[PDB]
Amino acid sequence: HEIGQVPLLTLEEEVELARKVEEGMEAIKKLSEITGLDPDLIREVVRAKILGSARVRHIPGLKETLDPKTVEEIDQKLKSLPKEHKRYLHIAREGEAARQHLIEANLRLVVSIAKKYTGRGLSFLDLIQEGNQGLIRAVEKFEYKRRFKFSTYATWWIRQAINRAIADQ
Amino acid sequence: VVSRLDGVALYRFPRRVRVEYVKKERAGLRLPLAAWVEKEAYKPGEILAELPEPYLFRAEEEGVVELKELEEGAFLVLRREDEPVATYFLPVGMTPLVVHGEIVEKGQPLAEAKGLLRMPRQVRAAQVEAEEEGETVYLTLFLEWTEPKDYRVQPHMNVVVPEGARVEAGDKIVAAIDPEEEVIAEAEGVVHLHEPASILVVKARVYPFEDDVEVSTGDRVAPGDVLADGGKVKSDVYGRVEV
DNA sequence: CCTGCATCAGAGCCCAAAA
DNA sequence: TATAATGGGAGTCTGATGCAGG
RNA sequence: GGGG
Ligand SMILES: Nc1nc2c(ncn2[C@@H]2O[C@H](COP(=O)(O)OP(=O)(O)OP(=O)(O)O)[C@@H](O)[C@H]2O)c(=O)[nH]1
């Protein structure tokens, strides 16, 4: 019932979200150069403001405990940028927002792949969650320029994730 | 399609981008004198002259005809070799008697003018200079008008320009996967968005900004929080920021 | 206020008990 | 790592107590 | 399934 509350994407909508995610990744790379920060640290800080205060925790690999003090300090250095530099902050924020929607709109794909993998020692929902893990991998690696529909690329990463799950757990 | 809620309507994916290009040109006309109403300028639609009987507007140069037809009204352009020798303006009520690429000689009728002739709806008259010779007046008209051109947007293309934007020569309107198929602005013009894929009705407030904006997208905001332009524009409703 | 009505937690001991 | 693929399959009888309902 |  919860997946059925996110409508499926139009070819246009699919390309639009995919486009914004790629541009945002490029924006974060550039924001690293300008600022002297870490591309991952910036990405987690950018991502923190989109999802909200709900999720705040230390992230394995990040140099800073990622508590409200550090995200305010670092966000204020990013919002203190000149107009031509600060345009990249707006890009990163919108990139993360579109990523969330892209993932959510493709959840039904994972179900249709996982249902075929039942009976191998993982419960249906365990297969869905591992399948969702691959979908996240697929959204980050997708290159929209190749003109392929998203469903084609995702399926490889989702199939890969379920099969690794069954073999490991 | 009928909307179910109050809010801001938003265009999703315009299939057709129409650019109205701005043209300012000096073109001539000759009319009787006992028939033209004297004004120093003409608003669109304004009556230029009224003829008792049909008058034949005649060529004042020899050349080949380049005919450019507007929605209503016409332009006629004579050139010998490729050098343009004349630019004539035919208002509404004046029917061209020549066809594109036709040879004409000095003195042959280009257009018939019958009754009341007025400015077309899309074209203006800024400065109007006149000369009087015999029983006719020759108007040197400084005309301004917009010529529409349509561009098609494909699913892999996104429009990078807002409704009503100002573009000079070279500006990008639509972007695409590969360098070809891009839409580059041919010359100065204004942009209009048409045929959207769907209309997204959002319950939201719109706060335009000229200078740099201090809140980035995703921030949450309460009435009174400063948005952009150093404190000039601020938020009314409780809500979520979209830049 | 009172009564249907469900959801839950009970239902003997010891021995072989041949999987 | 790239045609596209987008919402699942399946099983008695007793007494005590805390609950939405004429 | 079997013993008291
Ligand atoms: N609790 C219990 N007792 C059992 C069970 N099976 C056998 N018995 C014993 O079987 C005994 C039956 O003994 P009977 O031979 O019928 O004793 P009786 O009253 O003298 O009857 P008669 O010998 O015919 O005169 C009882 O003493 C039980 O303890 C059982 O499954 N459960």
Q: Do A10 and B216 touch (CB under 8 A)?
A: no
How far is the C-alpha of B74 from the C-alpha of B63, rounded, in Å?
Answer: 18
Residues 6+ apart with CB under 8 A from B38: B130
Å separating the CA of residue A5 from the C1' of nucleotide D22: 39
**Interface check A57 vs B, CB under 8 A:** no
Å separating the CA of residue A169 from the C1' of nucleotide C10: 39
How remote is the CA of residue A97 from the centroid of ligand 1, in Å?
A: 79
3-state secondary structure at position A60: coil
Q: Do A93 and B218 touch (CB under 8 A)?
A: yes
Give me the helix-helix angle, A68-79 and A11-35, nearest 10°.
90
CA distance B177 to chain A (A): 6
Q: Experimentally, how was this structure solved?
A: X-ray
- Please report the DSSP string for B133-195 in residue order: ETTEEEEEEEEEEEEEEEEE--TT-EE-S-TT-EE-TT-EEEE-SSSTT-EE--SSEEEEEE-
CA end-to-end distance (rounded Å), chain A: 27
* Helix H or strand E segment including B58: strand B47-58
3-state secondary structure at position A123: coil
CATH number at A89 reads 1.20.120.1810
How far is the C-alpha of A47 from the C-alpha of A22, rounded, in Å?
Answer: 15
How far is the C-alpha of A139 from the C-alpha of A150, rounded, in Å?
Answer: 9
Q: Which nucleotides of D are covered by protein (CB under 7 A)?
A: 1-9
**Cβ under 8 Å to B: A residues 24-53:** 49-50, 52
3-state secondary structure at position B93: strand
**Contacting residues of A for B229, CB less than 8 Å apart:** none
Strands B172-175 and B158-159: antiparallel
- Check whether residue A17 has its CB closer than 7 Å to nucleic acid strand D: no
CA-based nearest residue to A166, from A130, A142, A141: A130
- Which residue from B212, B218, B220 is facing A97, i.e. has the nearest CB? B218
Structure tokens at B28: 């001539």
* A126: Cα within 13 Å, side-chain hemisphere: 14
CA-based nearest residue to B173, from B164, A91, B198, B197: B164
CA distance B213 to chain A (A): 8
Å separating the CA of residue B28 from the C1' of nucleotide D10: 88
**Interface check A79 vs B, CB under 8 A:** yes
How far is the C-alpha of B242 from the C-alpha of A94, rounded, in Å?
Answer: 9
Tokens 């003409």 belong to residue:
B42
CA-CA distances (angstroms) from residue B172 to B15, B61, B165?
16, 41, 12
Number of structural domains found in chain A: 1
Residues 6+ apart with CB under 8 A from A159: A113, A134
- Check whether residue A148 has its CB closer than 7 Å to nucleic acid strand D: yes
How far is the C-alpha of B59 from the C-alpha of B97, rounded, in Å?
Answer: 11
Give me the helix-helix angle, A83-105 and A107-114, nearest 10°.
40
Question: Residues of B near A (CB-CB distance < 8 A)?
Answer: 12-13, 155-156, 158, 177, 197, 211-212, 214, 216-220, 243
Q: Report whether A14 contacts A149 (CB < 8 A).
A: yes
Q: Report whether A95 contacts B222 (CB < 8 A).
A: no
Considering all nucleic acid strands, name the nucleotide whose C1' atom is nearest to the C-alpha of residue A14. D6
Considering all nucleic acid strands, name the nucleotide whose C1' atom is nearest to the C-alpha of residue A154. D2
Which residues 119-138 on A are within 7 A of strand D at the CB atom? Answer: 124
- Which residue from A12, A83, A89 is facing B216, i.e. has the nearest CB? A89
Exposed, middle or buried: residue A14 (CB in 10 Å: 0-12, 13-18, 19+)? Answer: buried
* A162: Cα within 13 Å, side-chain hemisphere: 27
Torsion angle of the four alpha carbons A17, A10, B154, B71, in this order, in degrees rounded to the nearest 10: -120
Q: Most A CBs within 10 Å: which of B157, B212, B217, as the mutation test of the A interface?
A: B217
CA distance A146 to chain B (A): 9
How far from chain centre, in Å, is Cα A163?
A: 22
Q: Report whether B191 contacts B162 (CB < 8 A).
A: yes
How far is the C-alpha of B184 from the C-alpha of B44, rounded, in Å?
Answer: 30
How far is the C-alpha of A130 from the C-alpha of B186, rounded, in Å?
Answer: 51
Number of residues assigned to chain A? 169
Q: Could you give phi then psi for residue A24, rounded to 5 degrees?
A: -65, -40
How far is the C-alpha of A18 from the C-alpha of A143, rounded, in Å?
Answer: 8
List, in sequence order, every residue forming a beta bridge with A77; answer none if it has no partner. Answer: none
By residue range, what is the domain housing residue A138?
A: 1-169
- Please report the DSSP string for B106-119 in residue order: TT-EEEEEEEEEE-
How far is the C-alpha of B1 from the C-alpha of A51, rounded, in Å?
Answer: 33
Kindly report the number of other CB atoms within 10 A of residue A111's CB atom: 14
CA-CA distances (angstroms) from residue A26 to A19, A43, A89?
11, 11, 11
List, in sequence order, every residue forming a beta bridge with B166; answer none if it has no partner. Answer: B190
